[PDB]
Copies of this chain bind each other. A is one copy, B any other.
């Protein structure tokens, strides 16, 4: 199917939509945000929303409602986004501007401790960093009190990379969801703790506004207090990691996944080590914030 972009279902799943900005939209966007380097976006957070406005305005204001419709739709909730003409590591700054503009049409990206900024870039080259190790499926933000509504993962560079696809699991594609959701431990608050902060307690499952399951789970930060919790969690982990509903999604340079962190889990497949390997990623995580017609008190 829009003004300034096209939208088509992915080859991995009808739940994941691919949104591509047209060449003209991309050139006009880059022109109109040229006066702010990424460093200005880092220092003045209102500029993150301003570049969002510029991009949405170039799409006849059709972009923001579509992003929101898609991310909040339980049947979908995931986008793979790119702009024609932004597809090489030399354009890293333009990539950051684009992902920033999209994210701040639907919410606000949170401070990232790994970078000290609202986004983090990191390069993979040359236990947790083992190429043969899958990064298991999980939700972000489980070790703080506030809810993380979205995860954004952008491929900045890729050289001599075999494997390393993003892994995704939509809870409604997870055949064994009801088995674990209906267990009493599904709704028991457990301790979550970050590595070097104060521990938080919340269950690994919750519900959305309609009573449907959502998840706040990661194997590294959950801290079972006893043998009962620990054995159950290892069984949950196994059931998630072996689910036949998992998607394996290549993320080419210049594209980014933008997913609803409440009912999508994400991870990363193993990849083959190689001396000339280079992979560069950028991430943002944040909360949704958007207008709706709803009730308020006083004047």
A172 to B104, CA, bound (A): 34
- A43 contact set on B, CB distance < 8 A: 127-128, 220
Q: Given A47-B234, A219-B44, does the pair A127, B37 have CB atoms closer than 8 Å?
A: yes
List which A218-236 residues lie within 8 A (CB) of chain B: 219-220, 222-231, 233-234
A52's nearest neighbour on chain B, judged by CB, is: B227
- A225 contact set on B, CB distance < 8 A: 108, 289
Residues of chain A at interface, number, CB under 8 A: 40
A40's nearest neighbour on chain B, judged by CB, is: B127
Q: How far does the Cβ of A106 sit from chain B's closest Cβ, in whole Å?
A: 8
Interface pair B127/A227, CB less than 8 Å apart: no
List which A226-249 residues lie within 8 A (CB) of chain B: 226-231, 233-234, 237
- A47 contact set on B, CB distance < 8 A: 234
- A196 contact set on B, CB distance < 8 A: 116
- A234 contact set on B, CB distance < 8 A: 46-47, 49-50
A228's nearest neighbour on chain B, judged by CB, is: B291
**What are 21 A-B interface contacts by the 8 Å CB criterion?**
A37-B127, A43-B128, A44-B219, A45-B222, A45-B223, A45-B224, A46-B219, A46-B233, A47-B234, A48-B230, A49-B224, A50-B230, A50-B231, A52-B230, A64-B227, A104-B230, A108-B224, A108-B230, A225-B289, A227-B290, A228-B291
Chain A residues with CB under 8 Å of chain B are 37, 39-40, 43-50, 52-53, 64, 104-105, 107-108, 116, 127-128, 196, 219-220, 222-231, 233-234, 237, 289-291
